[PDB]
Each structure stands twice: as C-alpha cells, then as structure tokens.
C-alpha cells in the first residue's frame, strides 16, 4: 500500500478555530435569537492540542471567530509556505447548519468555502500532501433517530 510521507518535524500546522461566545449572533441575526454559547468547547481544543502535539504538529489556536475572521486566518495559511511540512490540519469547533458552519456573529461559512482554500492551485506548497479538516458542529436541528440491532 502507498502511504503519504509523514516524517517532517513538525508534521505541519494544526489550526484550531474554537468558537464559544455567540452573543453577536444572538444580537444580530433574528433567527439565532436563542443560539447558545458553546460551554465546554475549550475541553475539545485542549484535547486536540494534546493529541496533535503528541503527533508532532504545531498547534495554532484561535478563539471566538466571526466568519470574516475565519476567512482571514485561512487566507494566512493558504499563503504560507508549507514546503517543509508533510500535512496540514484544520479543526473547527462551532455551531452550524446544513452544509455550513456559523461564525460567532451568526454569519454562515459553507464548508466547501473553507476546504477549497487549500486546493493544490490555491496552496501549491501542500500539493500532493494530505489536508485534513475536522468539523465539530451541528448540520441542522434534527435529532438522529436510533434503530435496534443485536449486540456484538
């Protein structure tokens, strides 16, 4: 089996966008009048930091980001030189809806608009290298139902 090269030290950047405070959304976006703050989200940022530092990544945390701020951070990394890296990771911790994540301001960012900043054309120094995005957000307001199965 072919395996991606993964020998650099650090392996690459691991961005963490950690959205807690949604007061701006509650104030500005009528339908989001009751969107809640994401209490506990720092426990995920910390877990990802521990995990990915152990795996030799350079962690770059950013707390409480509006959509425009998220695009700015991504633009910085898209323009960066990743030639000496073997991988790039971006973790987003936020609210969301179908196909989107919310900024703290309640504006929407389609997921594809985030990942597409790192295509081989837009970020040539990551061409041929794995780009990993972890998105911890809702994708709508429905509860997924359960189905009964036999125990393994």
């Amino acid at each position: 089996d072919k395996v991606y090269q993964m020998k650099s030290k650090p392996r690459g950047y691991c961005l963490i966008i950690n959205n807690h405070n949604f007061a701006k959304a509650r104030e500005k976006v009528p339908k989001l009048h009751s969107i809640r703050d994401r209490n506990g989200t720092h426990l995920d940022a910390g877990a990802l930091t521990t995990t990915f530092e152990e795996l030799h990544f350079e962690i770059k945390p950013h707390d409480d980001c509006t959509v425009e701020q998220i695009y700015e951070i991504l633009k910085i990394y898209q323009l960066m030189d990743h030639s000496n890296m073997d991988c790039f990771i971006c973790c987003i911790l936020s609210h969301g809806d179908k196909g989107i994540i919310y900024g703290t301001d309640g504006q929407e960012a389609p997921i594809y608009e985030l990942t597409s900043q790192f295509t081989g054309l837009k970020c040539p120094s990551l061409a041929g290298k794995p780009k990993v995005f972890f998105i911890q957000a809702c994708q709508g307001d429905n509860y997924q139902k359960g189905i009964p199965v036999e125990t393994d």
């Binding site: 089996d1 072919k2 395996v3 991606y4 993964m6 020998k7 392996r11 994401r38 209490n39 506990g40 989200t41 426990l43 995920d44 877990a47 990802l48 521990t50 995990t51 152990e54 795996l55 030799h56 991988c87 973790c91 911790l93 179908k98 196909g99 997921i111 990942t115 790192f118 295509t119 081989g120 054309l121 061409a127 041929g128 290298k129 794995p130 780009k131 990993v132 995005f133 972890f134 998105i135 911890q136 957000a137 809702c138 994708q139 709508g140 307001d141 429905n142 509860y143 997924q144 139902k145 359960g146």
Partner: protein
C-alpha cells in the same frame, strides 16, 4: 511532470451527517472530538491509518445516546485521499 486533481488529498471528518445535531457535554467536551482524540492517541502508536481510526470513531459515537430526546449521532468522513494516511508517533 505528472498531474493529479486540484481537489486530491483531502480528508473531511464531520461530527454528523447532514440535517442533524451533534452533541456537546459541557463537562467533558463533544462526543466526536473526545472520541477522535482517544482513538488517535491509542491507535496512532500502533500504526493504524486514519480511515481505520475514523471507522472506530463511527462505532464508538454510534453507541452513545441522548436519553432526554432519544437522540443518536452519526459521524461521517469524506475523502479524496490517494494513499494511506498514518501519523507516526515517532
């Protein structure tokens, strides 16, 4: 030179399938991220690849429940990876 697709080599790990919520315990973290980190920390030293790890996250998160609303959560990876992806601990 050789050419591959512009959109090659991506892995997108979603905490949930479309249309649905994902869960956050204020006292522990989210079901998805906590499971992801536990599985990575355990299995990356064993040389397991990320798709195998993400399959385990699917299994683990699928066993959790919200007994207030009778809710479940189904994570979902999507990928254009062209090789095995491992994160060696060394």
């Amino acid at each position: 030179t050789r050419y591959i697709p512009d959109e090659a080599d991506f892995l997108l790990g979603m905490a949930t399938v479309n249309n649905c919520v994902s869960y956050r315990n204020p006292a522990e973290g989210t079901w998805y991220i906590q499971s992801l980190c536990q599985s990575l920390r355990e299995r990356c030293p064993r040389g397991d690849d990320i798709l195998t790890i993400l399959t385990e996250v699917n299994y683990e998160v699928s066993n959790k429940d919200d007994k207030k609303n009778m809710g479940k959560q189904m994570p979902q990876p999507t990928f254009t990876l062209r090789k095995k992806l491992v994160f060696p601990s060394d």
